[PDB]
């Protein structure tokens, strides 16, 4: 629909971005407010860093892909400076969360709790046919009452015939990413299964980084020998196991979000 009859647009003067919250090569996000009174998360884009085509192609897809476990499309500004306008997170990203006093304090039954609620949200892109791509706990935002959602589709794409194929010139964090997918750049809904079990290992450590005093050449070895992650401090071994299905040789044998999901709501609920 064309921006005068698009649901999504709304009037740039709706809008007071009060708090930058980050700032990189492709523009700023920042805390603001929509019609006095509605906090809003504001993303802008910085003119001649990137086409505004490829930066409303994020927009695009959100719009195809609302539920209550992914950060929700908010509005539109489609003139110069383009901004996406999405859901408010109060905790920010997990990553972050999981290492301030708050998030330092949160015991297993809730960390297992915010994995499921993870899932959940990972199950409902999988039954749309779509695929995330950068799942890792940098995308997931915490909300005031600590659930979660998964943000952050830049990356996203809808799936045709079970698998995407990127560039050979492109480039994905290798700690994250499935071999199949740095490889051969095919991505499959078992490659974010397999970034999902990494992203386990970052709720149980509060955040740290993956592979503990690997660079990316020896973490691409050791998988080639068949080792996977060396088990995390004080994470509990039915959660490891959890991981190491996650982490799969063939695509195929590595579970649906939808197993994952439950699974994780049995391991919260008997803790
Ligand atoms: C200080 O970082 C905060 C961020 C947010 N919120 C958000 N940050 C988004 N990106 C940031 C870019 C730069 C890197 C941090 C973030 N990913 C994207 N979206 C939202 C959102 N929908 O709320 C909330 C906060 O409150 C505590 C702190």
Known sequence: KPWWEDEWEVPRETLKLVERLGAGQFGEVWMGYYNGHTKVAVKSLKQ??????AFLAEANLMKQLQHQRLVRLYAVVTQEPIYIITEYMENGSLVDFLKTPSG???TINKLLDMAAQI???MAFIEERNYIHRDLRAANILVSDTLSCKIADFGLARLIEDNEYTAREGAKFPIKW??????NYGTFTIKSDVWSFGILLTEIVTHGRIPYPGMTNPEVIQNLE??????????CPEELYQLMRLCWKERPEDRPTFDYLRSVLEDFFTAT
Request: zero cysteines; charged letters at 30%; aromatic letters at 4%.
């Open 48 to 53: 001649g860093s990137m086409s505004p085509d």
């Open 104 to 106: 330092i304090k949160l």
């Open 119 to 121: 899932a959940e949200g």
């Open 177 to 182: 990413t499935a071999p199949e997918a740095i």
């Open 225 to 234: 020998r068949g080792y996977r992650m060396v088990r995390p401090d004080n």
